[PDB]
Every structure is written in structure tokens, then in C-alpha cells.
Amino acid sequence: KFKRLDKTAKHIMQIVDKEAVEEVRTLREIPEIKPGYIVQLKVEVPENKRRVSIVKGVVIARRNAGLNSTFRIRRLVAGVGVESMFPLYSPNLRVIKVVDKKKVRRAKLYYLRE
Amino acid sequence: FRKLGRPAGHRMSMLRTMVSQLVKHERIETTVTKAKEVRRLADNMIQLGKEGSLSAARRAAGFVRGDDVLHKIFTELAHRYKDRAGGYTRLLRTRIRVGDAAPMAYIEFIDRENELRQSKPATPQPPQRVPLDPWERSRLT
Amino acid sequence: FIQMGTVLKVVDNSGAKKVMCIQALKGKKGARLGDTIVASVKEAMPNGKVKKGAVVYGVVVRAAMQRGRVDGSEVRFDDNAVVLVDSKDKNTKTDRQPIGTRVFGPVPHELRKKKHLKILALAQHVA
Amino acid sequence: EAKQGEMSSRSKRTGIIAVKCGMTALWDKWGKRIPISILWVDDNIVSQVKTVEKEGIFALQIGCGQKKPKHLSKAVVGHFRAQGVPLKRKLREFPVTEDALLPVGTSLGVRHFVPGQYVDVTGITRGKGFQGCMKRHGFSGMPASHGASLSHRSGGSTGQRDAPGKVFKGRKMAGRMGADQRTVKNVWVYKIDPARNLMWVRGQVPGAEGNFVFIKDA
Amino acid sequence: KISKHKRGIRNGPKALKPVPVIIRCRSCGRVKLPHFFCCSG
RNA sequence: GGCAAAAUGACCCCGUAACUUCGGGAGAAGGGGUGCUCUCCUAUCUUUUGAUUAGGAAAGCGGCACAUACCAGGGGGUAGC
RNA sequence: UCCUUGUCGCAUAAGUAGCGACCUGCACGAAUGGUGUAACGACUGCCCCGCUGUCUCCGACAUGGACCCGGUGAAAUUGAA
RNA sequence: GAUGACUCCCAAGAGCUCUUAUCGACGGAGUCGUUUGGCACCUCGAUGUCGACUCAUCACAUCCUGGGGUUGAAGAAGGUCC
RNA sequence: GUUGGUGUUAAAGGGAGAACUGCGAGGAGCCAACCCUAGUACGAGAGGACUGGGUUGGGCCAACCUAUGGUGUACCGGUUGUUAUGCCAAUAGCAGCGCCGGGCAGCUAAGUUGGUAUGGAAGAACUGCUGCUUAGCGGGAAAUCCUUCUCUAUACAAGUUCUCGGAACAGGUUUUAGAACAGAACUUCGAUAGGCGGGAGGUGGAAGCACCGCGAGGUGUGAAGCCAUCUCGUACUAAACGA
């Protein structure tokens, strides 16, 4: 016992992360979102109030840092190319379901970035 | 954490020779703040003697060198710590003398014939338990 | 950062094709996505409303600068593109009024927050 | 912010001394993300009530943390023992009004702070060592393709026979930056827990990755 | 140019402090600062 | 003052402007190809036994990337001398 | 070519520059050569392309000194302070 | 301190009426030491010269912000002045 | 900027550890747009208020990396040339990480925060009213001085409180702190660092084995395999001390 204060504070952090992680996996839907998937989902934005009901494009990378966990999608929508980043346990994402897998060698598929 | 002030290739290619000599011989006398560094490669090369598989052997083939200290590890250091869980070197501070004020240090293994600080007995670890955060110890007096 | 010297694409259907920044009316480094820039047309169809070598305003719609919404989300297009607005040569009443007829190319809906609802309404589909 | 906590119309209530645990990211009901800091209050208690009557000034001596007799240096073992007060990791005094005066030996906690209102922290910040200008003060620097032995240094004081070699109190490269710097008029406390006595704050609280912060303004 | 006064003043505060606690191998001969490996027993 | 730094670079193939003293500009500019695997035919090769090494066909196979590291031209337009 | 940033045009968001032209040449001029010229220049000027910390606005990282201990151990200068 | 900048004096005339809102001709009054300068006192057994970068600092005879007077100040833009 | 000595009545030879107070010094004082009140006063409309509240931005400053970027030279994987381990296998050295694609903690800003205040006094022209011809007071400016923030008792009228007296040091393992010094943590009735186990966190399908194909190569065994960091267990190592 009596570990150093910094050690105990980092412990508090790693704890109080999974606390809220479970506290949202008790009510939300998520898939496994391995890179190389092709994902579909929805986002209501707090600016307009709009909810586009769908977006689509390959998933290029993610960081499973915890409650914060970003991932990026190479949505080429009627334009040069649009790369998006979403935190996974958002209050917005709801339909994060449609996947279609691949076989990727790299882990962060960046080389697709032109 | 130490750089020792050496290009990171030459630094390794020295530390390898040092751990390898620490296994060929049984004791060495070296500058302390570098003994404090072989303090890690020696143990991570004892763990491979303890595992001994083909994988974890062909890996040690890279980290140790000079002679067949490879076999020395695999054959005697395993069998002499098949039980000792962690902590396989002593790193005493002899500060004998140099002409450069550089400290000096005996570093050598544990359960030999003539060690330096006659050791404690190799006790198997107890198994893990769940950590808790009561913070209930007032420590008043 | 879209700043002096940048060379970004016109993406409405006015005369000019390529427009070269000279300013950022509300920045000190370059102007991030969604902010009026001043710039000088560099090439046009011979018949549009704008002729090469003429300072004209503009609003940003695509910028390789990543930008995050307030939602923690982040987006970054590929190239730099802007849409024109008539210069201040018309009064403050017409602030934030476009020139062309239809932009084409995805658009971020931070233009709303930035009060560019005029160009917004014409948008193909807001990212 | 008034009519809360525990006092009369107008005073300063005592401050509470906590530990910077780290940062994370919450959300609101309107679906927006705010960074978060968790300040851990380690069962802070009163250890000396300072007195204009006897000593001269109005101060509550809050102790924080936990310590052990093998860790204290006897001159403070004696203090704690004479007070008869459980051992703490660091002491800290606050000046507070005549009212808001506590009994020796009353522990404090985060429910002292009503949510939704603000605080002022004071955290001995994260120095960086014997830095130099261009980071210590955001000075510019001469170009990197024309000038020699200056690419990263500074200028020269005003100087000539007038202001005779008298560099006024200027700005030079200097030692480290660890000090106590308030974040005045913080933004409202999101939430504080009945048990576990934490508290989340909108963010940017000074101090280390632990071991240092104070709180007041309430 | 600068004389004994300043020279002494500068070399002084760089004075040698007698070393604190110092222990000897009770019978094994040598003397040493603490935390050394003089001997064995 | 694009000083420096960057970049281009190799081999093979495609194609190559003004100008002219008709020799040149010209590596003008501007592009593509470059890995390995087996097979086929071609040459060639006496280093014997028929295969081996290179070229060029055409089908795969892997990598973001195949002169992968080292080596290796920035180019164009126009004055003055 | 002082007046001189002459004038006009080209070009640039803007060009005391660059190029073309005007002759109002303080003070061009035909072997102290006049005008032009393909090729050529570690020659001066301008423009464009690609490339980039030169820059907005700098950041992290590597080694060597700078720092610190044990050695050895100079140097300008020096009215005295 | 001549020229210099500024202030102040007077007030022909302009300001449709009006000298003084705003100016203001002739002629004077002073303040400062910033352009042009005059003198050659310190330095020629040495006081490194323009411009730029960095770094600022002071004065206020004020460009904005800050207050008020006044206006040929309806409001708004101004003007001028403290 | 960082420190060591010293002075400071005192009681222990007088030596200290904390905790303040803060004589006084520094720091911070920005502005726009937009909406409202309000098409209101004014004006024939044209036009367009005064003021106070509210928002949205820029600059400036202080702080924080949880996210995003950049890096991350003792990590993971791909990969070329060569030399070695006889060869296959799997590795190593070297090419100033050999070159690529990744990369946590740390650091930084392109990111994020947070400030650009209130209250109080004195009081500028400027304004008023009394006066009683001498004078009286009140408004009265982003201005001055106090309140916030910082620094401070060598503040020589040298301040006050608690406590220690084998007390404070010193040394050793580190450090969220760091050029040495300093601070802070730990010093065996112990988590101070290493080590070992468990996760997290990064790379991204280990070898051997089995299959498919002549091969390049592919698939299964298999989120396999490893590990720079982070947490968590355990005194196995090195931090007691008999000067």
C-alpha cells in the first residue's frame, strides 16, 4: 500500500474510464469496427439540428483510447474526398451497423489518402 | 533510460558484450551508472533461459553473443532459478577507485557458491488479488 | 492555412475558375474553414460575370485544414475551394450574398453558424 | 453566485485542497463535448483555527492527504499530535472571515461546493527547467538562412551612453517556470460525488500530473 | 588587475567541507563512506 | 536576391518546340516501363553430358512502395555583356 | 538620360524593377568599332513551372560541445581600487 | 535658434447674414531643439557609417478607443477645441 | 534566474521544521461586428438615434495535452545491398533510425481551456448649486490609488502561531522537480526504482505444424506474435544501521 500519489491518480483515471464505458455499453449499440471495414452510420449535428440519416465510406483508422476513441472514414461524397473523424461513444451515432469487411495488411489505412 | 553518451548502435553493441561477459564470467566490475543499466538486460536474458523454447531461444541468440553463454544460460541459469520469480542480479556499489572519479560496482548473479551479500531464499510469488481504493487509513496519533 | 499566396478553386458556376488568395478578413494566420477571404481571380471563361485580374471576395467551402465541429467530430476535405460573393462594392445590406447559380461539391454546414445561410440554402448537401 | 454552501450574506468560505488526477471528456444533454478535470479531495480536515484575538489573523489550517510517522519530521509530528488530528500529506492555510469559522477537527469534502457555480484554483504549475526566451517569452528570432550565431537568441537592450549601460528590468532567458498561477473565475462545476468526493471541472486546472492544487472562491 | 581581495573572496566559498559520517571495516582494514562493499560477513 | 534548403536524377522505350552559322538546340520540353515466380522461344554454350545466364514474349504473385537502401541533371520563357 | 519614378503599352490585386515603343541624347555613334546574332557562361536582370521551414509560426528528436566530478591546464588585458 | 515646427498677438477680407463656426492678408509676439544650418569646445596612441531583423522605452505637441465645451451641432456622420 | 553563508532579544547552548501576516514591488487594464430595446427621439422621407442589456468574433496574455494534429533514434511490421552464424530456418552488424507504414507516455499548437471585473476612495477639464464676495460642496474621463493575481520578514522597529529537541541535517533509490545546488517522494512495520506475473495501450496475423498449388505464394491452427510506455499484484533484487 501507500503507493506514490501520481501512481494512484493514474489509477483513478484508468478506473473512471471503464466506469463510464460500461455505463454507456449498458444502453448503446456499437459493433466491432476493425479497419478495412466499410461503415454506414448517422449523425445529428448540434449546429443545425439536422440528422443526415446516413454516411458511408471505408474506415481508415481508430484509437481505442477509451470513452474518447476516434475513427476516420474516407467518405468520397460527390466531391474530391472527405475524411471524417468521430468519437465512438458519441451521443450522436446511432445506426453504426452496416459493415462490409476486407483483408488489410497495414493497420491504419492511410495510403488511401491519395 | 540511460544514454551513456554513445550512438544508439554502439550503445547496444556494447551492452550486448557486457551482459554476455556477465554471463561468461560470474562477476564484473564496471561503472555503476552502467551497471544500473545491465541490471535489465541480464534479467530479460534470464527469462529466456527460463522459457527455453525454440522461439525464446532463437530470440536470445540475438541479444547474447561472444560465445555459447547462450548455452550457459539455457543450461545452468534456468535450472538454478526455476523458481526465483524476478530479481536475478545483485548490483553492489564498490566505488573501488578509478582515476576518473567514476564509481565502480560489482554486478553478479545470486545463488552461486560465493556471492557477495548472502541472499534470501527463492520463494514462489503469491498469486494476484483485486486492487481496492478504500483510502480508510486515518494514521492518527 | 489558407493565407496570402494560396491558390484555390472556384466552386460556384460564375465566370472564374481559379482564384488566388490575398487575405483573410477575420484571421491573422490563414483563415480556417468557413470564413470570408479576399482574393484575385486568375482564370475565367471569357463570358462569365468575373474577369481575370480583379479583386473579389469569397467564402471558403473546402479546405485541407482539418476542422472539428463542436461535437468533437473532425472533417477535412481534399482541396481548397471557395464560392464568390459580390464585393463590398455593394452595401452592408447584401453582406453574405453569392454570385452564381449553383455550387457543386460537398459543403460543410458550419456556414450556418458563421451566418452564411444565403450560400447555405443553395448547397447540394451539407456535410 | 450567492445563497449556497454554508454562510451568511457576504464572506469568504474556506478553501479546499485537492489533487489533479487527469483529464477526460464528458458530454452535455445538448450533445456537446467538454473536457474534464478530476480533482481528488483526500479527506481534508481542520488542524488550526487562526485568531486575530490570540495570533492576529483569521485563518483555517486545512490539512490534506495522509502521512506516516516514518515520513514526518518530528517537529510536525508534535504539531499534529498536540492538535490531536489525523495525519495529512500537506498543510495549507486560508484567510476567511470571522464567520465561516470551524471547530478543530471537522473534515471537509466536495459537497461543500454547490454544482453549477465557479471556483478559483491555484496549482503549483509544471515548470520546464532553465528555458530561454522564444519560449519563456514568445520572442521571435532572426532568420535561419542569413544570420550566424543568432538563429534562436534575442536582441539587445536600448542602450547607448544615454540610459547608460543601464538595462532596465528587462526580459532574459531565465530559470524554470514552476509557480502557483490561479485560473480566476473558473467555469461551473459539472458534478461532484457524494462518495468518492471527486469533482469534475470544465478544464485547464494548473498543477502537476497529481499532488498539487488548491480551490477557493466559494 | 583584481587583487587578493577578490581572488580570496571567489576561491573561498568554494571551500572543502569535511565529509560527514565515515565508517571502517571493523576488522577488515579499509575505511569508507557508507553504502560500500568493503568486505563480507 | 528562392542565398540556403528542397526537389529532379539511373537504365529502356515513347515522343521533342522556337531558332540556325543547318554542326546544332537536344538528356530539348512532355510521358510510360523497371520487383520476383513458371513457361517458350530465341542465343549460346562447351565451362561434356543439356542445362545454365540475358532478352523479350505472357500468365501469375506479394508489397503503399519494386534504378525500393548507396549512387544519382530542377526545368521552361526573355533582356545585357 | 541628373529633370527621372519622363511618357505610353505589356504584365501584376499594386511592378522607382523587367520587356516593347516615343526622341524632349544634360553627356550614343560606327575599329578606344555601330547594330544584330545560333551555340556557350559557378556572367548580371526579370517572369513562369515543380520543390520546399526561406516564411506565417515555429516544434520534436538525434549526436558534439555548453552544465557536473577527477586529472592536466593556456589566452589576449591589466595606474592603483 | 537665423531658417525650422508649434503656439500666441492683431484683424483688412471670405464665410448668403457673420470678423472670430471656420478661417484669416499685412505686420508682431514667444515656446522647443526635430529639417537646414553656424561655431570647432571633448574624441584622430580610434568615439565602427545608412537601411533592415530582434528588443523595446519615454515625451505628448493625440491616430483610435476614453470623457466634455462648442459649432454654419435637426438626427446621423462630421468640424474645432479642452 | 538558482542557491550558501549571515544578522534577527528567545534558552540551550540556542539549534530547527512547518504555517501565515504582507511594510512594499510587479502583473493585468484591447476592440470590433451583431441583436435587442428601437424604425423609438430627430427628420419631408431619405435616412436614422441617444443609452443599457444580450450574443458572435478577432487581438493580447496565463494555463493544460483528455482528445486532433507534429514528433516520438532502446517499440511493431514491410523492405534493398552486403558480411556472419556451414546450408534451410530465424536472427545480427552496417549503410549518420539504411529506407519505408505505423506508433503510445513525454513534449508542443495548428488544439483546447481561462482572463480582458466588480466594488471603493481621491478626483480631469467640463459642469452645477450655495455663498457673499472671502468661500462652500457634487457630479465629473479606458486616467491615478486600493480590492483580484504574483513576489516578499536581511520588512535591520529585522514581525506572529504550532511543534522538535538525538531534533534538524548528511548519505542511498527516484522524481510530477531538475544544469550542480534546491524542492518533493522513498529509506526495510518498505512499493523508492528494477525484476517477475495481469491487464490496459501500439504493431497487426509469430514460429513450428497441418493443408492448397510447380512456384512466386495462399489458408487454417490464431486479435495469433511481440512490447518503447501506463496502471495493478509480489520485497525477488538495491535503498535500515549498530561510524
XYZ file of C-alpha atoms (C1' of nucleotides) in Angstrom, chain H residues 2-81:
80
model
C 18.726 82.663 -38.106
C 15.728 79.283 -41.225
C 12.834 75.197 -38.878
C 7.703 73.018 -36.390
C 4.222 74.841 -32.955
C 1.711 78.327 -30.146
C 0.087 83.134 -29.432
C -0.878 88.598 -30.883
C -3.727 91.923 -34.268
C -7.689 91.589 -37.787
C -8.235 94.081 -43.639
C -11.400 90.208 -46.214
C -14.029 85.258 -47.224
C -17.701 82.681 -44.615
C -25.588 84.463 -48.458
C -26.499 87.322 -42.890
C -21.166 86.776 -39.833
C -14.878 89.425 -38.143
C -13.596 85.028 -34.967
C -18.172 78.359 -36.515
C -14.447 78.131 -39.658
C -10.807 80.892 -41.361
C -7.882 84.647 -41.903
C -3.972 89.370 -45.747
C -0.427 92.886 -43.871
C 2.586 93.126 -39.774
C 4.472 91.382 -34.499
C 4.864 88.428 -30.157
C 7.293 83.602 -27.764
C 7.925 78.499 -26.608
C 11.125 73.595 -28.371
C 15.618 71.969 -30.060
C 13.166 67.592 -34.890
C 14.948 69.878 -41.081
C 18.613 73.223 -42.981
C 22.360 75.205 -40.772
C 26.644 78.456 -37.656
C 30.685 77.885 -34.112
C 35.335 73.676 -33.962
C 34.848 73.076 -27.101
C 35.590 66.645 -25.769
C 37.451 62.207 -29.112
C 42.028 61.115 -34.643
C 48.464 56.278 -29.440
C 40.450 55.245 -32.785
C 34.087 57.555 -30.297
C 32.587 51.270 -36.341
C 28.912 54.937 -41.008
C 22.989 54.217 -43.783
C 18.830 50.555 -44.030
C 16.526 46.019 -42.220
C 15.723 41.942 -38.182
C 15.213 41.378 -32.669
C 14.271 44.019 -28.476
C 11.907 47.894 -26.530
C 11.486 52.695 -23.741
C 9.998 57.822 -22.937
C 7.528 62.597 -24.141
C 2.541 64.166 -25.773
C 2.711 68.949 -29.318
C -3.213 62.728 -29.641
C -4.227 58.311 -34.991
C -8.262 55.074 -32.461
C -10.518 53.802 -28.129
C -11.791 57.388 -23.252
C -14.530 61.602 -21.475
C -16.878 67.295 -22.268
C -17.363 72.587 -24.467
C -18.888 74.436 -28.859
C -20.474 74.515 -33.953
C -22.998 77.390 -40.122
C -24.439 70.663 -33.569
C -32.322 68.740 -36.528
C -30.648 63.041 -36.233
C -26.650 60.825 -38.318
C -21.830 61.386 -39.996
C -18.540 65.196 -39.130
C -15.711 70.409 -37.612
C -12.889 72.555 -33.799
C -11.312 72.792 -29.100
